[PDB]
Design an enzyme around this catalytic site. Sequence first.
Site, short mmCIF file in Angstrom:
data_model
loop_
_atom_site.label_atom_id
_atom_site.label_comp_id
_atom_site.label_asym_id
_atom_site.label_seq_id
_atom_site.Cartn_x
_atom_site.Cartn_y
_atom_site.Cartn_z
CG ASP A 282 -2.09 1.01 1.06
OD1 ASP A 282 -2.87 1.18 2.03
OD2 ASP A 282 -2.21 1.63 -0.03
CB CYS B 225 -6.06 -1.28 -3.77
SG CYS B 225 -6.26 0.43 -4.29
NE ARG C 285 -2.45 -0.92 -2.89
CZ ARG C 285 -2.66 -1.65 -1.80
NH1 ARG C 285 -1.93 -2.76 -1.59
NH2 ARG C 285 -3.58 -1.29 -0.91
CB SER C 286 -7.29 1.04 -8.21
OG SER C 286 -7.54 0.08 -7.19
CD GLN D 37 -3.74 6.39 -2.18
OE1 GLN D 37 -3.37 5.25 -2.19
NE2 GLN D 37 -4.57 6.84 -1.29
O1 VO4 Z 1 -5.73 0.71 -1.25
V1 VO4 Z 1 -5.11 1.90 -2.60
O2 VO4 Z 1 -4.27 3.14 -1.12
O3 VO4 Z 1 -3.39 1.64 -3.41
O4 VO4 Z 1 -6.16 3.35 -3.25
#
Ligand code: VO4
Length: 298
Positions: free
Chosen positions: A180, A214, A220-221, A261
Site C-alpha cells: 500500500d 485495492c 494502486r488501482s 497516491q
Molecule cells: O488501497 V489503494 O491506497 O493503493 O487506493
Amino acid sequence: EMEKEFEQIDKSGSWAAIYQDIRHEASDFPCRVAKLPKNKNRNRYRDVSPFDHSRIKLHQEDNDYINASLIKMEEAQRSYILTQGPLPNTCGHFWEMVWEQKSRGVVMLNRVMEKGSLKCAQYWPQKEEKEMIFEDTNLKLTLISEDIKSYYTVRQLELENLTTQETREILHFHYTTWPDFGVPESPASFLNFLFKVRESGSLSPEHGPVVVHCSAGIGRSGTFCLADTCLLLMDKRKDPSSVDIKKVLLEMRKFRMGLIQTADQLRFSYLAVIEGAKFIMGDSSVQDQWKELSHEDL
Ligand code: VO4
C-alpha cells in the site's frame, strides 16, 4: 517521448513537484451522495468518495449507493470500475454491482491484511466446498478453481443470481505483493500481471467494465488503470510519442478522485508504460522476458 521527459524529470529530481502539479490541476466534482448520513457505513475512508456524476448506481430501490466510479476512457475505448475494498456490510453490494455491470474480471491489488491492519473484507470464498451466499442481494458465489503463483493468484469464480438462477464465470486476479502506497517490485512483474488480465478477456468490450480495487481504490488501482490505458492508446496509433501520460492521468481523475497516491507510483507508471511499449511496438518476445524476470513459479 515519455523517455526523454522521464529522464528530464529524473535528472532534476522533480517527481514530487510534477506529482503535486497533478494534484493541483485535478478535477474537483461533488460527492453529495457518498456524504449522505445514510451512506456513512458504506465508505471505508472518509476522504475517498466517488463523484456523483460517475458513481456506479446499484439497481435496487432501497439504497443505490456504493463506493465505486466508472472510468470511461473515451479515446482509448476502455472502461474500468474502480472501487474500495468491500466492507463486511457491502460484499453483497459489490457482487450486485459486478452482476448488474456485466463484469467478467475483478482485479484486486491489495491483501486482506496489510501492515497489521484489515484493509478489505474476505468477499470471495477461499474453499470450493464453502460457497458464499449474500442474502441481501440474493447472489451466490462459488470458488471453482485457483491458480497460485508466487506474487499473484488467479481464481475462477461462479456468480449465480439466485433470483433468475442464471450463472456467470468471474475471473479474480489477485496481486499479493504490491505494498500500500508502494510500487510493484518491477515493471516486469507488473506488466506480466497486466497482460495476464488482458489475456483472460476480462478487459474486452464484449464484457462489462473490469472491476479494479485495492483498499481505497485510487492508488494502486489508479496505477494499474493508467498503465493499461496508456499502452492501449499507444497500440491504437502505434505512436508512443502521441501519448501524454500526465494528461491521461488527469483525464482519469475526472471520474474518480486521487488516482495514484504518491510521486513514486507516478514514476513507476512511466516505467511500466515505457517498458510495455517494447511489446506494443512489435517485440513480442519481451512478454516472455517479463514472465521469466517475474519468477511467478512456486
Ligand atoms: O488501497 V489503494 O491506497 O493503493 O487506493
